[PDB]
Ligand binder design. Sequence first.
Ligand SMILES: NC(=O)c1ccc[n+]([C@@H]2O[C@H](COP(=O)([O-])OP(=O)(O)OC[C@H]3O[C@@H](n4cnc5c(N)ncnc54)[C@H](O)[C@@H]3O)[C@@H](O)[C@H]2O)c1
Ligand SMILES: NC(=O)c1ccc[n+]([C@@H]2O[C@H](COP(=O)([O-])OP(=O)(O)OC[C@H]3O[C@@H](n4cnc5c(N)ncnc54)[C@H](O)[C@@H]3O)[C@@H](O)[C@H]2O)c1
Ligand SMILES: NC(=O)c1ccc[n+]([C@@H]2O[C@H](COP(=O)([O-])OP(=O)(O)OC[C@H]3O[C@@H](n4cnc5c(N)ncnc54)[C@H](O)[C@@H]3O)[C@@H](O)[C@H]2O)c1
Ligand SMILES: NC(=O)c1ccc[n+]([C@@H]2O[C@H](COP(=O)([O-])OP(=O)(O)OC[C@H]3O[C@@H](n4cnc5c(N)ncnc54)[C@H](O)[C@@H]3O)[C@@H](O)[C@H]2O)c1
Ligand SMILES: NC(=O)c1ccc[n+]([C@@H]2O[C@H](COP(=O)([O-])OP(=O)(O)OC[C@H]3O[C@@H](n4cnc5c(N)ncnc54)[C@H](O)[C@@H]3O)[C@@H](O)[C@H]2O)c1
Ligand SMILES: NC(=O)c1ccc[n+]([C@@H]2O[C@H](COP(=O)([O-])OP(=O)(O)OC[C@H]3O[C@@H](n4cnc5c(N)ncnc54)[C@H](O)[C@@H]3O)[C@@H](O)[C@H]2O)c1
Lengths: 258, 258, 258, 259, 259, 258
Amino acid sequence: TIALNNVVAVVTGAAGGIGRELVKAMKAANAIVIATDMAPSADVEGADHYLQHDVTSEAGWKAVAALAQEKYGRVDALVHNAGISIVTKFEDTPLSDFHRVNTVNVDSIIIGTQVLLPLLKEGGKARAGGASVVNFSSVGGLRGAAFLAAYCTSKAAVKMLSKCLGAEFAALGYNIRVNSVHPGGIDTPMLGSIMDKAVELGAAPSREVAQAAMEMRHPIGRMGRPAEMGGGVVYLCSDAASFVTCTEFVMDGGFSQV
Amino acid sequence: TIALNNVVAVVTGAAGGIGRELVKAMKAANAIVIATDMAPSADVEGADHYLQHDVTSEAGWKAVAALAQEKYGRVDALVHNAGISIVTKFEDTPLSDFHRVNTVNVDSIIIGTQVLLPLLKEGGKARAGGASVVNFSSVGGLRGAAFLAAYCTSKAAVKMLSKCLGAEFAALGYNIRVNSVHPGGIDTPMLGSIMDKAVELGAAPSREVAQAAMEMRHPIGRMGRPAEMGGGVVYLCSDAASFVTCTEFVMDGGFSQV
Amino acid sequence: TIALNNVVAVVTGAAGGIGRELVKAMKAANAIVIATDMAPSADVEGADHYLQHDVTSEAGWKAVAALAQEKYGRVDALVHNAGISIVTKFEDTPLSDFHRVNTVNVDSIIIGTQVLLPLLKEGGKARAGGASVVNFSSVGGLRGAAFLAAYCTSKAAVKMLSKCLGAEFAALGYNIRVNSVHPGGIDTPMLGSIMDKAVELGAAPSREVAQAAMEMRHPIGRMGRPAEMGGGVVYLCSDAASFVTCTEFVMDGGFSQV
Amino acid sequence: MTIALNNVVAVVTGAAGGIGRELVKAMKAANAIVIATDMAPSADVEGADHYLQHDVTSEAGWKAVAALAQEKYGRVDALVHNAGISIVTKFEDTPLSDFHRVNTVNVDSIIIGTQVLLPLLKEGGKARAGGASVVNFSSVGGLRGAAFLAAYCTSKAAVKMLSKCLGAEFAALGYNIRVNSVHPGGIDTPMLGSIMDKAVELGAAPSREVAQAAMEMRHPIGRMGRPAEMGGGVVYLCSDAASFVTCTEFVMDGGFSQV
Amino acid sequence: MTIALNNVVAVVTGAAGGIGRELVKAMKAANAIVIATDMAPSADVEGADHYLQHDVTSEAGWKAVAALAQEKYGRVDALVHNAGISIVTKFEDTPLSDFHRVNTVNVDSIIIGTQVLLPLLKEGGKARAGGASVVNFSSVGGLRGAAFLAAYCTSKAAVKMLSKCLGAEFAALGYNIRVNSVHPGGIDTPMLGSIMDKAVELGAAPSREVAQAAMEMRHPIGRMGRPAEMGGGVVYLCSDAASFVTCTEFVMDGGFSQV
Amino acid sequence: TIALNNVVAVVTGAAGGIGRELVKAMKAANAIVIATDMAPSADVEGADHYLQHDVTSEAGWKAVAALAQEKYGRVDALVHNAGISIVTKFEDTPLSDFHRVNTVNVDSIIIGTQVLLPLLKEGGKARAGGASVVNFSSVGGLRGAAFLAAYCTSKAAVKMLSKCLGAEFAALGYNIRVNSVHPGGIDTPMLGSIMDKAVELGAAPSREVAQAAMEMRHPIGRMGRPAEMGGGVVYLCSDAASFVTCTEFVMDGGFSQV
Ligand SMILES: NC(=O)c1ccc[n+]([C@@H]2O[C@H](COP(=O)([O-])OP(=O)(O)OC[C@H]3O[C@@H](n4cnc5c(N)ncnc54)[C@H](O)[C@@H]3O)[C@@H](O)[C@H]2O)c1
Ligand SMILES: NC(=O)c1ccc[n+]([C@@H]2O[C@H](COP(=O)([O-])OP(=O)(O)OC[C@H]3O[C@@H](n4cnc5c(N)ncnc54)[C@H](O)[C@@H]3O)[C@@H](O)[C@H]2O)c1
Ligand SMILES: NC(=O)c1ccc[n+]([C@@H]2O[C@H](COP(=O)([O-])OP(=O)(O)OC[C@H]3O[C@@H](n4cnc5c(N)ncnc54)[C@H](O)[C@@H]3O)[C@@H](O)[C@H]2O)c1
Ligand SMILES: NC(=O)c1ccc[n+]([C@@H]2O[C@H](COP(=O)([O-])OP(=O)(O)OC[C@H]3O[C@@H](n4cnc5c(N)ncnc54)[C@H](O)[C@@H]3O)[C@@H](O)[C@H]2O)c1
Ligand SMILES: NC(=O)c1ccc[n+]([C@@H]2O[C@H](COP(=O)([O-])OP(=O)(O)OC[C@H]3O[C@@H](n4cnc5c(N)ncnc54)[C@H](O)[C@@H]3O)[C@@H](O)[C@H]2O)c1
Ligand SMILES: NC(=O)c1ccc[n+]([C@@H]2O[C@H](COP(=O)([O-])OP(=O)(O)OC[C@H]3O[C@@H](n4cnc5c(N)ncnc54)[C@H](O)[C@@H]3O)[C@@H](O)[C@H]2O)c1
């Protein structure tokens, strides 16, 4: 069946709403989890290790690589879950706001995957199914939205980078699977901020009309819970997903398909 | 834990290449499996029941509903895996060949889902995550191909029917998730026949050049194995996929994404 | 530039809301237009010929082929614009309602293209850019919707048949381009009926709430006008579109992309 | 001609390139007034009413384009972001600065240029019921990934999504500005030439002849596109005939993305 | 489809000669990739994608052809053995070494060349359902004897029979390689010119005008052929349209052999 | 290339296995095709005209001449493809069976060529390469066979008549090329009947042993397909064959040469 026995996993943004549930779900499937986030310390349920880690910092990633190299000699699963959102009027958005969103959401994947590539190649030799890189995109990487230009653009970049790396790592014989995950509206502080900033921009009349509109756009009729992201990430990280690479893995309550 | 504890599952085309692996995988996750196919009897490893079942027959589906109703009182998971393929020159394809492919690949889902809907509504009350309907489409439902007009058209119909039923069942409050599965080239008798018929048509120079070309179109660089379909179907049927409806679930080695 | 000089065009459903505007637009670009519909006679502005034509009838299509063969010796452009819609509850929809929608929307393209294929091959020799087959799909062929299972399934079939025929006709050297057109909500009797039947079904509270909801789902903020379909069809039929085949040509005010 | 650009003031970037020259010819043939821009200090661009030296990465360069359009016409009806670059690289040997260089030319060009020309595009939006038209050059590479094209493909997917967001935002704010992405397949230009050669040097393809034949066969139509085959599509998107077309992926790829 | 050589990698020997130049033009016009070879260190062969210096009697020369085809394309779809010589002699004054010289160019060329290119032709056999195509230049002289042409006629009959044997053998071994012989009549080239002049010097003919008229009258069509009239036949044999043609005598002789 | 631009072509036995493929191939090379056979009507793809035509009837040939004269003023290509076979014991074959085979296979060419000669002379003026007469002989016109005395004798007569007419038309300055075509075993109803009658005669043990024996006599190792006759006939009819007259054009998979 679907398990992560003898899987050494790195999860970024691990102290966030989705991140904490990914760590719990992956531990429950018997993974060894290195959890990382911006805080100098955190109590992340299911983590075997916590590291302070700015995903924009090559030095931060080298510290993750050093701990994994010393303690395990490989990385089997890399979950790029760290990200930010802004809600802005395009004409009032300086180029530096696009660049800040790009640095956290996309450069994180480029720097992190380059630094951990030797360790992922070892993951590729440890399991016939391959090492697994899971990149957090969004339904915002599939469908546009007014006032989300910077966020949506970065999440479409994440999606396409996933396809290119899946194809490249397979062509070079590294046995590393790369997939993008596309959550719908998930009940976390990030969705909260986006909704509030939508109201202050005057995109929505009130926070109640905004919430009801967003809920109704999902065919399933509600926001997702962070725990509903866990199974999908466990599946992609497992040998059960040995024929899954370059894929858009959608967990959006039907949002993108209507 | 991605599991199918207390899940009553119906799997059609269960004696086929993928079907046998679906039954094994679902039993291994603790499902009760009603396996069905065209043969009057079959030894399907992991099946609790086997029924002779032509998926084009309303009477055949009523016999499946009667056994499930009598023995369990619900259906938690319905896997529409039965399907056929033809390879033909469009101009030499009579309308009756399109209709034959449509009857097995699409009408099966319409008739079967209508007949089992009362039992799926009971599945919807038995699990918070919902009853799960899994429709076998294809990468051929996403991307066209010369000489596969009848097959590809039917698999695109399967894909869109999945989106419509997911949205409709959610709007009516039935708590039934509906998803389409899109396998790439999977090593089964069906792929074998398609490749041989492609050679006889003169679409491919030889069966060796056809095989190498098809393998190279997959970024992962090979055909899939039937067992590689099992985990994905178990995930979609489980409560772990409670936020997954109307979705294209792709298991294609990256075929569709390059 | 974009023109249809010396283009012999067949347009089905030519007496409908979009059809009449397609005939006007194509005449204005200097096409010779054979207009066809169900009525025994019609005054279709811009038509050089009108034929009574049931697109579900092989005999009806042979009569179109005979007139084109006798008067011009080729067909340069074939616009499959004839189509119907129903709005229904899936569980109350007999298989015969799916079949009726399939026969008009899909079998029309299969029968018509097979019957006109010799004449389209002559179109393929008359213009370097190729003969052009334009199939009317829908945003309903791209995105699912509650209560539109029969319609959406048929329009996804139209879309995929277009991809397969584009690829097949190119592989066989016929120089015939095939593309699908995907209108959003266009202000015609068909959209009118769908909205009214949605009210009678109880899918929408009132015809005013339905209209406002459908308008708001389009980023552009309104229904399309039938005339807004004309330029796109003229483009696809012209030599300006010589590198366009197998394509989804979307005219939906942004509907599918948010 | 019934699809036309009468009284359309058009800005076309990368106008001296393979596709750009054909866009200018096609748009002039549909009666547009064309401001052509590229990196060269001077160029003879057939159909251009004006040529400006213009680095699309420069806010100051864009302000000079805005000043000429403002002074001579008082509006911009059509903005074609056609300037772009490609690189072909091994991901693990690609410094972050190479991703940033590709992003700056292919994406920041659209952000800076559209911000600077927004007042003039708003005037375009008042001049035609159909709206001002912004046409962003993405790629089939913005729809489908490819080994060794990580930096290029990522930038072209960003272009595609930015197009959808701006189409939706400009409509929500009532500016009457249509925004669409164009997705060419393999078009016979120096850019496709360089990509194929660099693919050989990287050892992605055995020879330049096997690479060319493989790329041609991936297109159902069975050949590369010619630059002229991009012209009609861009004319259509810029015209009032496309008044119901915004946020759209406009594909001119010989069927590449659909098989 | 029709008769075409799309994605056909073709080797043509004696490509700088009268017939050879027309074969290269005709095969390029049908969209073949043509590797042209002849004795000159360089030549301007219209329609050739590559020219190689190549003595068809040299195993090393053939290995250089195989290396270029292997490196650039990975297969050979069509091999046209067009290189040949003629002599006109009195049998009793013809040393064994003159027979051997004609045999080496006209026959050993086909044996050495086909053996060296066989791995590449097997790949041609996998690339097309119709098969790789080997086209051997025989002659009406390989069908009908003639006074004073003993060395030439003997070599051209050997070419004809080798073609039948290789067609049958390659089919029995499952290689999917078609082999056919081509039998031109009198074609207006330097070779026909020399044969006629040497016939006069030998005292076979009174004058070059009486020789020409006699040879023309032997052809029912009433004239010599033009080199361009060989092109279509070779294109046909090299194409998938000839998928049921192997071991065959393909005659282009104005009726010479049939009266 | 090799093409039939502005070529007016008459093809007899055009509704048969090879004949239908000849018409398709010749239309694909841009010929104007007058297709003829014994049925009062037929749908022959690529035919510009169909005529009911018994090739043994001078009156039937005059009707072909009248249509060509009225509509085009010339014939550029004449394909004598109509023929029959019998399989018999010589000693049980009455003289009238030899005469019936001679009338269809040989007298057809004599009558047809005499009646169309004025129109063929005009074709000789219309193209430098000449009018082209293509006579269907057989490998049976080159090599004898037990039980095929009547058929083989007629096909050798066809072959020699071709040589004589090629030489005579050139001597008289008409610019009309005449060639014989020699198919091997081609997969058509005619080969089917010959094989079955070979079994009934007791020439072969079974229809499977007969088929395998006949296939093995062809060096290429199989029967030909009717489509494999097309390119050869197009070549002979084209200006590319301007130096080809009196010739045996063999399409026999090597049958005659081992
Ligand atoms: N919540 C949703 O509706 C939703 C929808 C689509 C996609 N996503 C994606 O899911 C992922 C997780 O989002 P979430 O809802 O859990 O949000 P969250 O903000 O709750 O968690 C994100 C975490 O990322 C961390 N982080 C931010 N910048 C960092 C940096 N430079 N270095 C290291 N860590 C950094 C934050 O500290 C935070 O703990 C993100 O990539 C987000 O874009 C979420
Ligand atoms: N194998 C591939 O490469 C591939 C690719 C994409 C899609 N698929 C789909 O996956 C599913 C399983 O395919 P597979 O590869 O195992 O093929 P398979 O032929 O091995 O199995 C299909 C089964 O369907 C059964 N079946 C056919 N018609 C039926 C009918 N009328 N009633 C009941 N049963 C019927 C057959 O008996 C067979 O057991 C199919 O829907 C197929 O189209 C497979
Ligand atoms: N109007 C929209 O909102 C919308 C949206 C998506 C796509 N479309 C598609 O665009 C096309 C044009 O639709 P419209 O809006 O003009 O609808 P319409 O009903 O105004 O026109 C459709 C025409 O089809 C004809 N028709 C129906 N069945 C026929 C048959 N069997 N044989 C021949 N003619 C037949 C009708 O007589 C009518 O003239 C259709 O294919 C439709 O599905 C329209
Ligand atoms: N040719 C293809 O196959 C292909 C495929 C898909 C997409 N595209 C896209 O189409 C567009 C046209 O490309 P092309 O094929 O004509 O290539 P090209 O290189 O011939 O033209 C691109 C032009 O952009 C200009 N340019 C580059 N950087 C610039 C800068 N900083 N400031 C101003 N001008 C700058 C160059 O000077 C050049 O003239 C590009 O966006 C390209 O990415 C091309
Ligand atoms: N011209 C005729 O009447 C006639 C008749 C029947 C057969 N053919 C045959 O057609 C073919 C072409 O003849 P053509 O008339 O064009 O003659 P040609 O002399 O014009 O050309 C023959 C070519 O072969 C080349 N060649 C000779 N020895 C060679 C060697 N050792 N290695 C490589 N190249 C070598 C010559 O340099 C020349 O370019 C020959 O095989 C000839 O025998 C010609
Ligand atoms: N098929 C083989 O194996 C083979 C081998 C050698 C040569 N051939 C020759 O090829 C040609 C085509 O044969 P096929 O295999 O297509 O057979 P076929 O029987 O399918 O076609 C022959 C056609 O000739 C027509 N015909 C017969 N008598 C006629 C008459 N009196 N007037 C007009 N039409 C008449 C028939 O109606 C038929 O349509 C014939 O000349 C045949 O002898 C066939």
